[PDB]
Design an enzyme around this catalytic site. Sequence first.
Site, PDB file in Angstrom:
ATOM      1  N   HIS A  68      22.685 -15.437  62.811  1.00 30.15           N
ATOM      2  CA  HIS A  68      22.746 -16.816  63.371  1.00 30.15           C
ATOM      3  C   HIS A  68      21.815 -17.723  62.565  1.00 30.15           C
ATOM      4  O   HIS A  68      20.885 -18.306  63.143  1.00 30.15           O
ATOM      5  CB  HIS A  68      22.449 -16.828  64.871  1.00 30.15           C
ATOM      6  CG  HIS A  68      23.601 -16.386  65.712  1.00 30.15           C
ATOM      7  ND1 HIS A  68      23.664 -15.131  66.273  1.00 30.15           N
ATOM      8  CD2 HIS A  68      24.718 -17.034  66.111  1.00 30.15           C
ATOM      9  CE1 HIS A  68      24.773 -15.018  66.974  1.00 30.15           C
ATOM     10  NE2 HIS A  68      25.437 -16.175  66.900  1.00 30.15           N
ATOM     11  N   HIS A  72      25.572 -19.028  58.324  1.00 30.18           N
ATOM     12  CA  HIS A  72      26.570 -19.070  59.427  1.00 30.18           C
ATOM     13  C   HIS A  72      26.983 -20.523  59.680  1.00 30.18           C
ATOM     14  O   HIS A  72      28.202 -20.789  59.756  1.00 30.18           O
ATOM     15  CB  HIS A  72      26.023 -18.382  60.679  1.00 30.18           C
ATOM     16  CG  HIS A  72      26.893 -18.575  61.871  1.00 30.18           C
ATOM     17  ND1 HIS A  72      28.154 -18.028  61.949  1.00 30.18           N
ATOM     18  CD2 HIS A  72      26.692 -19.244  63.022  1.00 30.18           C
ATOM     19  CE1 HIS A  72      28.687 -18.338  63.117  1.00 30.18           C
ATOM     20  NE2 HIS A  72      27.819 -19.094  63.793  1.00 30.18           N
ATOM     21  N   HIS A 106      25.773 -26.271  65.235  1.00 33.66           N
ATOM     22  CA  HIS A 106      26.219 -25.642  66.510  1.00 33.66           C
ATOM     23  C   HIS A 106      25.299 -24.490  66.948  1.00 33.66           C
ATOM     24  O   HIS A 106      25.346 -24.158  68.143  1.00 33.66           O
ATOM     25  CB  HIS A 106      27.682 -25.202  66.437  1.00 33.66           C
ATOM     26  CG  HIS A 106      27.852 -23.860  65.824  1.00 33.66           C
ATOM     27  ND1 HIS A 106      27.768 -23.667  64.470  1.00 33.66           N
ATOM     28  CD2 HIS A 106      28.056 -22.651  66.372  1.00 33.66           C
ATOM     29  CE1 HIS A 106      27.946 -22.391  64.204  1.00 33.66           C
ATOM     30  NE2 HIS A 106      28.107 -21.748  65.352  1.00 33.66           N
ATOM     31  N   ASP A 107      24.522 -23.880  66.046  1.00 35.06           N
ATOM     32  CA  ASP A 107      23.586 -22.771  66.376  1.00 35.06           C
ATOM     33  C   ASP A 107      22.138 -23.142  66.002  1.00 35.06           C
ATOM     34  O   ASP A 107      21.328 -22.221  65.800  1.00 35.06           O
ATOM     35  CB  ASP A 107      24.014 -21.468  65.697  1.00 35.06           C
ATOM     36  CG  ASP A 107      25.034 -20.652  66.485  1.00 35.06           C
ATOM     37  OD1 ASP A 107      25.025 -20.727  67.719  1.00 35.06           O
ATOM     38  OD2 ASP A 107      25.806 -19.919  65.850  1.00 35.06           O
ATOM     39  N   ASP A 217      33.808 -20.684  64.733  1.00 35.93           N
ATOM     40  CA  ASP A 217      32.605 -19.884  65.076  1.00 35.93           C
ATOM     41  C   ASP A 217      32.853 -18.401  64.802  1.00 35.93           C
ATOM     42  O   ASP A 217      31.899 -17.732  64.364  1.00 35.93           O
ATOM     43  CB  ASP A 217      32.198 -20.093  66.527  1.00 35.93           C
ATOM     44  CG  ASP A 217      30.771 -19.685  66.808  1.00 35.93           C
ATOM     45  OD1 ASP A 217      30.008 -19.426  65.836  1.00 35.93           O
ATOM     46  OD2 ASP A 217      30.435 -19.643  67.993  1.00 35.93           O
ATOM     47  N   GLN A 269      34.933  -3.091  68.104  1.00 35.16           N
ATOM     48  CA  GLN A 269      35.575  -4.112  67.228  1.00 35.16           C
ATOM     49  C   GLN A 269      37.043  -4.303  67.650  1.00 35.16           C
ATOM     50  O   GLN A 269      37.446  -5.468  67.831  1.00 35.16           O
ATOM     51  CB  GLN A 269      35.416  -3.746  65.749  1.00 35.16           C
ATOM     52  CG  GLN A 269      34.013  -3.990  65.206  1.00 35.16           C
ATOM     53  CD  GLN A 269      33.684  -5.458  65.042  1.00 35.16           C
ATOM     54  OE1 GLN A 269      34.281  -6.169  64.240  1.00 35.16           O
ATOM     55  NE2 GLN A 269      32.732  -5.942  65.821  1.00 35.16           N
TER      56      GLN A 269
HETATM   57  O1  LIG Z   1      32.159  -8.916  65.669  1.00 35.40           O
HETATM   58  C1  LIG Z   1      31.742  -9.115  66.789  1.00 35.40           C
HETATM   59  C2  LIG Z   1      31.400  -7.963  67.724  1.00 35.40           C
HETATM   60  C3  LIG Z   1      31.681  -8.414  69.163  1.00 35.40           C
HETATM   61  N1  LIG Z   1      31.097  -9.734  69.384  1.00 35.40           N
HETATM   62  C4  LIG Z   1      30.776 -10.110  70.700  1.00 35.40           C
HETATM   63  C5  LIG Z   1      30.030 -11.269  70.940  1.00 35.40           C
HETATM   64  C6  LIG Z   1      29.723 -11.640  72.238  1.00 35.40           C
HETATM   65  C7  LIG Z   1      30.166 -10.875  73.312  1.00 35.40           C
HETATM   66  C8  LIG Z   1      30.913  -9.730  73.074  1.00 35.40           C
HETATM   67  C9  LIG Z   1      31.221  -9.347  71.780  1.00 35.40           C
HETATM   68  N2  LIG Z   1      31.269 -10.688  68.543  1.00 35.40           N
HETATM   69  C10 LIG Z   1      31.568 -10.496  67.280  1.00 35.40           C
HETATM   70  C11 LIG Z   1      31.762 -11.673  66.402  1.00 35.40           C
HETATM   71  C12 LIG Z   1      32.682 -11.797  65.389  1.00 35.40           C
HETATM   72  C13 LIG Z   1      32.532 -13.070  64.829  1.00 35.40           C
HETATM   73  N3  LIG Z   1      31.573 -13.707  65.478  1.00 35.40           N
HETATM   74  N4  LIG Z   1      31.083 -12.857  66.471  1.00 35.40           N
HETATM   75  C14 LIG Z   1      30.025 -13.176  67.331  1.00 35.40           C
HETATM   76  C15 LIG Z   1      30.176 -14.101  68.359  1.00 35.40           C
HETATM   77  C16 LIG Z   1      29.087 -14.408  69.154  1.00 35.40           C
HETATM   78  C17 LIG Z   1      27.859 -13.791  68.953  1.00 35.40           C
HETATM   79  C18 LIG Z   1      27.710 -12.880  67.917  1.00 35.40           C
HETATM   80  C19 LIG Z   1      28.800 -12.564  67.106  1.00 35.40           C
HETATM   81 MG   LIG Z   2      26.215 -20.075  69.182  1.00 40.01          MG
HETATM   82 ZN   LIG Z   3      27.868 -19.690  65.859  1.00 39.47          ZN
END
Ligand SMILES: O=C1CCN(c2ccccc2)N=C1c1ccnn1-c1ccccc1
Ligand SMILES: [Mg+2]
Ligand SMILES: [Zn+2]
Length: 313
Positions: A68, A72, A106-107, A217, A269
Amino acid sequence: GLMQFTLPVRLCKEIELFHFDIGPFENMWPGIFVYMVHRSCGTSCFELEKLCRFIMSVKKNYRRVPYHNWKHAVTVAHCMYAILQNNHTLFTDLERKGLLIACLCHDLDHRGFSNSYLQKFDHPLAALYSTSTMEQHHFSQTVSILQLEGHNIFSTLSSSEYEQVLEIIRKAIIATDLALYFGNRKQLEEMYQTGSLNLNNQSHRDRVIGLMMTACDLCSVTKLWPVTKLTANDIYAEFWAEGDEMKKLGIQPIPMMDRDKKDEVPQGQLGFYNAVAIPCYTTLTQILPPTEPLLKACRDNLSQWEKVIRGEE
Ligand SMILES: O=C1CCN(c2ccccc2)N=C1c1ccnn1-c1ccccc1
Ligand SMILES: [Mg+2]
Ligand SMILES: [Zn+2]
């Protein structure tokens, strides 16, 4: 006024594609952002001096966390650039201004922890913002930077246009709370299928911009497999650190965040692609047909995670 940003030939061509990776040269990312603003919005949208000062203050307020981070921010902005460029006529002048800025911001000031962890920690931000905790903070940080001397990139907008663009930015940043995505997509699905989706309805435009923000995102899942695979390492580096901090609070984390359960990542995944990513890009492609390449790339990566489980890599 006549000072255009120009990229090397390979970047000039590949930046137009959804699956573009912005590369490991951090010092080129501000230039890449300005290039995208200039082509997506116009050379007149922002005062170059103010825009450059704004970008560098945004960069400074992203932290040195595995995922983050500033990279990103710029990656999410590029996905929004690709959507806007493939949907030339659908968006207003204020929207194209607001949305690249919303994505870059956004982050802002992310610590690498979820809303859930802040709530369980009893972080001061969880008392200030009871829902969408980090997303309300990100918007607050965006307004703070905009109000620094010489950082008001919107200064030529009227009072009412300024309020509209900051409202686009607020809704766009709040929409990146994945908790809110599920309901947003379900409503857009119903609207599309019953044929009631109306892009002149402001409540409907807000929903479509929300889904675009989720799509940008999550765009790590729409890159070529080697990029997606290596980005997944950074994502899970944060998850496992959050899991460690949950264990320090005397709470067993969910398996996704437990580094003792790395073997369960491939199946996790698949769940994410099937429950979040694929449905997101499917609904986006239904509303904005030219975003189909994101859905195709997402499906390609789903197939790669299935191969990891079959032990073919
Ligand atoms: O690849 C993964 C593994 C599962 N996961 C996730 C996130 C929140 C809740 C449940 C699962 N998110 C991803 C992912 C892919 C692209 N962006 N993000 C992401 C989104 C938000 C926060 C961190 C990462
Ligand atoms: Mg965010
Ligand atoms: Zn983000």
